[PDB]
Amino acid sequence: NDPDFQYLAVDRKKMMKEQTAPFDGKKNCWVPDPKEGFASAEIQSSKGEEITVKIVSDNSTRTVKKDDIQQMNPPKFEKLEDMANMTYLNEASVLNNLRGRYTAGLIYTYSGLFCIAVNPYRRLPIYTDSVIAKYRGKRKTEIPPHLFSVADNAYQNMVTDRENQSCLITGESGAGKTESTKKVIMYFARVAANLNLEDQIIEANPVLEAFGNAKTVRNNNSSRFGKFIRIHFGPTGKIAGADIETYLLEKSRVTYQQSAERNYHIFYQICSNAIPELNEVMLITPDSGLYSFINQGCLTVDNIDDVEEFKLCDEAFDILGFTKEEKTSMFKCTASILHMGEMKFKQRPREEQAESDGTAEAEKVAFLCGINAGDLLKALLKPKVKVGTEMVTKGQNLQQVINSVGALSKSLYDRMFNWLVKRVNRTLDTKAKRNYYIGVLDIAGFEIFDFNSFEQLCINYTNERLQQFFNHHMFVLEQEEYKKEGIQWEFIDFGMDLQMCIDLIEKPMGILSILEEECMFPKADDKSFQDYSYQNHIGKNRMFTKPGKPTRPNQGHAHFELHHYAGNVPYSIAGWLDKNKDPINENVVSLLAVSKEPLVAELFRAAFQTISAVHRESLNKLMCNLRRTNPHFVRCIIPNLEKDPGLVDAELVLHQLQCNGVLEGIRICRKGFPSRLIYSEFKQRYSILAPNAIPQDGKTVSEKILTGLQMDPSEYRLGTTKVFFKAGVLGNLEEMRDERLSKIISMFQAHIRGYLIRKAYKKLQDQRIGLSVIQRNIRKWLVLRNWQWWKLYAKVKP
Amino acid sequence: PKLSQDEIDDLKEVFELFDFWDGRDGAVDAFKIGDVCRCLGINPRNEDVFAVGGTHKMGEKSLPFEEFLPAYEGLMDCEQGTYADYMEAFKTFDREGQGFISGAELRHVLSGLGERLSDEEVDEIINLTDLQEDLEGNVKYEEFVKKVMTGPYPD
Amino acid sequence: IQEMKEAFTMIDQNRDGFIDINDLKEMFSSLGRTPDDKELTAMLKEAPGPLNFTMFLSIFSDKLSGTDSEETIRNAFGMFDELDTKKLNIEYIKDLLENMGDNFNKDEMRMTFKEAPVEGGKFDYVRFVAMIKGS
Ligand SMILES: [Ca+2]
Ligand SMILES: [Mg+2]
């Protein structure tokens, strides 16, 4: 209760100070608020599948359905820590306990396995060596909800148990997921030597943070790639150093900028007057609105001013280990792309074969690469093949090439990235000794939009796969707790339901395969593809549906809906067979292979396939890896869309918690026997429900209670140490307690009322004969004094 | 649920006596039909009595023995509490878990919960059982719960 | 049995060895203006005829038949006065008499408290039970 936990748990006072509510359990329940998502209520009269209802703070009489009506967790489970412990387990109930702890500064909670966290918008004491000193070694159930817990517990994992650990952290970068990441290592160190690595990597940030992070419609800055910062460990839990890896980064942002989205930040810092000394050498002008591979819509941004970094980056360079010599190749190389999209040509009139006009830029980039400006168009315009024996030049439709370049614009970058990594993978390759690690993957999570396409279907697929992974985890983690309790029958693996949706993507004649197919045939028509998938799916798969009812504002009508854990998503397969083609012109390779510059050499040094094709595998690479690492989780959440502390647009969290997996983990939880209890803390809490059948043990006292009570076997399952009940069970139990005490007290009160009176009774019987004697004679007297005769006697007494 | 002629005889004297306090006339105010039973031997509750005629205020409706006896039936059955029933409930406040509860907590239970008693009433019983609040203001809810149960005329 | 034969002679004026409707107002008026005929006659309506001594103390004895001692009565009060204060609060005893027991009627009341010791709101019963018992 010390001033440290000041921001961790609520002072035991407001537990004893809760008052207003009694939980008329029968009535007060959550309701679907269009303004607050789920507001508190109380009922009155139930007609049919309709209900007449009024609100709490308000008193609005709404008419709601018997379905939209959600159950409310009793006062008991409030501001509750691990939420898999609530009796009722739904959204509202979840939503709240989060808004509740939040509406009380609290920003960490355990949703089963998932650790939830909300951005405060106000840095707070929360992180300190003292606190770190406390958790240091303490198991989950010992101290409050806190990111530090996941860590040590991850630490404890890698060291004690042998193998590797992973801690999947996610949440729109409007949740500051990165800072939390900082912490994870700060702690992964301030406890790995107490028998910087932290800072070092924070500089490289603005490097990769001017690459893989761009302004995508919904975020001035979004990591468009997936990092897995592995932090290895030697024979004796020794930080060996720090290494990174770059998972599926979208190259696409290179050739196809949408209307509100342009490339990556770099060209925006390069074209910006950060350095007039280096502003020309690449052959480009200062304006950020005149570059075909950039002017599709956006330019500079608000709090971004896009300068300094281009200068600070310049520094992060020197800093590590690589002269300005290669550093230079960079600046320039980056330019090649710029002009590359700025190249022009033409074919013939009613014939198929291109020709130039932009040989200057062709000359530009070419030299900025050490290639004969005339070398390019030779292997580029009407290229050269390489069949079995003699290479035949392939006539060049504006098609194949126009894209072939969009391929070079990218293809280079990708490497020019994978390389850049390997480098920073070197700088810190300050190797000591390596045996294990505790990597920390972060990937852009699920995406449901106003208009969904190919790029979406993929991230999800990834995610769809990712979330599975978890299910399975929480499956086995459950499979032991049950058997560690003796109480154990079983239910099939959880991660199976997700297969249906997964195989409807990956597996052979499936959404992906098809597209992987039609990207070869030269008749690929958006509708042609649409056609095959249906004939291939719809009508006979329950994961592949058809664009239902327009749910929100004004949707962007599409061709189908995939049944994702998150929900059924609308995917507009329009222009897919057009974005996915990643062809290979086996010449440019060699051609770019050893031009004149070193890099240019090794990179290409070291077809006509597809992104998905790589995606598919690269993914495996990711998943497979994971399938061998005690998983951990962290789901940061952006309270609201206005960096305004306190505020909470539930809506914005329900969608988030819907895409976290949390809500599904719940659904997963719901099924079995969640709410477990120590017979110890079970009897004392629920002994009142059948006081007369308790001999007056513990695994017994409870044994009975449930029994005398009529507890339906379905409802629970006794372990050995503790007892498990069906979600919503305790709810009843509570309510029961609630009336019995209440009554039992009244009986006790009405047994006092007896006493008090059995007491006076006699005093009351004697008193009768008195009121009678008083009542009797005062009458007699009243008679004599009124008697005319008693007037004579009184009259004279001679 | 079938008073013996002894049992009935007893119901009379009481009823008889309780009607000499509202005014002989063979009528007992629906309000005392609770206090009457208490004298007979049953510790019914306010809900229990309100649901047999029982008026909330005195002098709202009077009862004849012929009308009364009926009601004395419904009350005989009303769930009467027990030592465990009680102890157990008084045990959910004994956080210390040693048979003690704040002197004021108690007062709270007895007149702040369920069918709130009356401060005078809480005093009367507290005074009638000499539940001497000890040292730091604490009482053994056990022995308080055994006295009230054994009535005001000890075994 | 004495205060009837001692004041016997004067129980009548002309002494016909008996009584006389005219010897009634004889020693009646002597003190204060007598009453109207029906009263003098009705006042005789009790003993259904020629009254004698034993038939006199059969009316004057008939009345005081069931009255308790000045201590009984006394005691009948204090069952209400517990702190042995020798006094009932005014409203408490009025309530006793008028709503409980064999209630007193508004008149019965009126007569009961016309001249009843009552200072500061405390009916002094030990004395009132003298105002009664010709104390
Ligand atoms: Ca009456
Ligand atoms: Mg005469």
To the query of whether residue A288 is one of the catalytic residues in this protein, the response is no
**Cα A690 from Cα A709, distance rounded (Å):** 7
Chain center to CA of A546: 27
Quick check: helix, strand or coil at residue A545? coil
The CATH number fitting domain B81-152, selected from 1.10.238.10, 1.20.970.10, 3.40.605.10, 1.10.3720.10: 1.10.238.10
CB contact under 8 A, C102 and B24: yes
> Is residue A763 packed enough to be buried (19+ CB in 10 Å), middle (13-18) or exposed (0-12)?
exposed
On whether both A537 and A472 belong to a single domain, the answer is: yes
Distance CA A725, CA A715 (A): 5
Among B21, B45, B151, the residue with its CB nearest the CB of A750 is B45
B-chain residues near A779 (CB < 8 A):
none
Contact A747 B124 (CB under 8 A): no
Which one of the ligands is nearest to B21 CA?
Answer: 1
B-contacting chains (≥3 CB pairs under 8 Å): A, C
Residue A629 bears catalytic tag = no
CATH at residue C21: 1.10.238.10
Contacts (Cβ under 8 Å, ≥6 apart) of A527: none
Residues near A780 by beta carbon (within 8 Å), at least 6 away in sequence: C63, C64, C66, C67
Query: Which residues of B fall within a CB distance of 8 Å from C102?
Result: 23-24
Question: What is the total residue count of chain A?
Answer: 798
A752 to A749, B101, B143: CA distances (angstroms): 5, 18, 14
C105 has binding-site annotation: no
Q: What is the CA radius of gyration of chain B?
A: 18
- C61 and C82 within one domain: no
Residues across chain C = 135
Q: Which domain holds residue C130?
A: 66-135
Closest CA to A180 of A632, A623, A654: A632
Interior/surface letters B80-110, b for 16+ CB within 10 angstroms, e for the rest:
bbbebbbbbbbbbbbeeeebbbbbebbbebb
Q: What is the token pair recorded at A684?
A: 């004392």
Q: Which residue is listed with tokens 């054994």?
A: B150
Q: Are C4 and C61 contained in the same domain?
A: yes
| Centre of ligand 1 from the C-alpha of residue B16, in Å | 12
Q: Examine the domain organization and report whether C110 and C80 are in the same domain.
A: yes
Q: Which of A119, A117, A103 is nearest to A36 (CA)?
A: A103
**Interchain CB distance below 8 Å, C59 and A784:** no
Residues of chain B contacting residue A771, judged by C-beta atoms under 8 Å apart: 20
- The answer for C 15-74 residues in CB contact with A (under 8 A) is 27-28, 31, 35, 39, 43, 59-60, 63-64, 66-68, 72-73
Distance between CA atoms of A527 and A788, rounded to whole angstroms? 128
What are residue B128's DSSP bridge partners?
Answer: none
Residues A620 and A714 both lie in one domain: no
Looking at the fold, whether C1 and C15 belong to one and the same domain comes out as: yes
What is the maximal distance between C-alpha atoms in chain B? 55
**Is A223 considered catalytic here?**
yes
How many angstroms separate the CA atoms of A363 and A375, rounded? 10
- List all residues 6 or more positions away from A379 whose beta carbon is below 8 Å from its beta carbon: A585, A587, A588, A591
Query: Nearest ligand, CA of residue B58?
Result: 1
User: Residue A248, SS3?
Assistant: coil
C43 with C70, same domain: the answer is: no
Which of C17, C40, C65 terminates a domain? The answer is: C65
Which are the contacts of A97, defined by CB distance < 8 A and separation ≥ 6?
A: A73, A77, A78, A79, A80, A83, A86, A109
Which residue do the tokens 């327009």 mark? A550
> Is A309 one of the catalytic residues?
no
Q: Can you give the length of chain B in residues?
A: 155
In chain C, residues with a C-beta closer than 8 Å to the C-beta of B24 are: 101-102
For A717, the domain range is: 676-731
Helices (H), B78-140: 83-90, 103-112, 119-128
Q: Which of C25, C46, C65 marks a domain boundary?
A: C65
Measured CA to CA in angstroms, residue A460 lies from A464, A567, C85 at distances of 5, 11, 92
What's the CATH number where A534 sits? 1.20.58.530
Choice among A40, A223, A463, A595 that is catalytic? A223
Rg over alpha carbons for chain C, rounded to the nearest Å, is 20
Tell me: do C58 and C76 sit in the same domain: no
Token output for A656: 């988030």
Say whether both C6 and C29 belong to one domain. Answer: yes
Both C127 and C92 in a single domain?
Answer: yes
Q: Is C99 on the interface with A (CB under 8 A)?
A: no
Q: Which of residues 734-793 of A touch C (CB under 8 A)?
A: 766-784, 786-790, 792-793
Backbone angles phi, psi at C66, to 5 degrees: 135, 5
Q: Are residues C26 and C79 in the same domain?
A: no
Chain A residues whose CB is inside 8 A of the C73 CB are 773-774, 777
Window B:14-43, CB contacts with C under 8 Å? 20-24
Read off the tokens for C74.
Answer: 């006394």
Q: Could you tell me whether strands A62-65 and A50-55 are parallel, antiparallel, or unpaired per DSSP bridges?
A: antiparallel
Mutate to test the interface with A, among B38, B106, B144 (most CBs of A within 10 A): B38
**Helix-helix angle A611-626:A454-483, to 10 degrees:** 20
Instruction: Say how many Å lie between the CA of residue C11 and the centre of ligand 2.
Output: 7
A187 token code pair: 């702690």
User: Can you give the resolution of this entry in Å?
Assistant: 3.3
User: Does the active-site annotation cover A680?
Assistant: no
Known binding residue C18? Answer is yes
Q: Please state the φ and ψ torsions of residue A510, each to the nearest 5 degrees.
A: -130, 145
Q: List phi, psi (to 5°) of A610.
A: -145, 155
The amino acid present at A604, given as its one-letter code, is F
C14 assigned to a ligand binding site = yes
Q: Which of the ligands is closest to the CA of residue C12?
A: 2
- B80 interface with A at CB cutoff 8 Å: yes
Instruction: Note whether B127 contacts A: Cβ–Cβ < 8 A.
Output: no
CA of C103 vs chain B CAs: smallest distance (Å):
6
Residues of B in contact with A756 (CB under 8 A): 121, 124-125, 128
B-proximal residues of A, 660-699, CB under 8 Å: 687-688, 691-692, 694, 696
Determine the distance in angstroms separating the CA of B53 from the nearest CA of chain A, rounded to an integer.
Answer: 18
Q: Which residue of A has its CA nearest to C4?
A: A793
Task: Specify whether domain B3-80 bears CATH 3.40.30.10.
Answer: no
The answer to whether residues C134 and C84 belong to one domain is yes
Same domain, C125 and C79: yes
Indicate the SS3 state at residue A651.
helix
- Collapse the DSSP code of A715 into the 3-class scheme (helix H, G, I; strand E, B; otherwise coil) and give the result: helix
Neighbours of C17 (CB within 10 A): 6
Let me know if the fold of B3-80 is the same as that of B81-152. Answer: yes
At A63, which amino acid appears? Answer: T
> A-C interface: how many C-beta pairs under 8 angstroms?
81
Structure tokens at A480: 């032991």
Of A766, A771, A784, the CB nearest to C63: A784
User: Domain count of chain C?
Assistant: 2
- According to DSSP, the residues that pair with B63 across neighbouring strands are B28
Instruction: Tell whether B5 lies on the interface with A, counting CB pairs under 8 A.
Output: no
Same structural domain for residues C49 and C97? Answer: no
CB-based contacts of C59, cutoff 8 Å, min separation 6: A789, C46, C47
**C-alpha span between A457 and A250 (Å, rounded):** 13
DSSP-assigned letters across all residues of A25-66: TTS--EE--TTTSSEEEEEEEE-SSEEEEEESSS---EEEET
Indicate if A173 belongs to the active site.
Answer: yes
Alpha-helical (H) ranges within A136-176 are: 147-159
Domain CATH code at residue A725: 3.30.70.1590
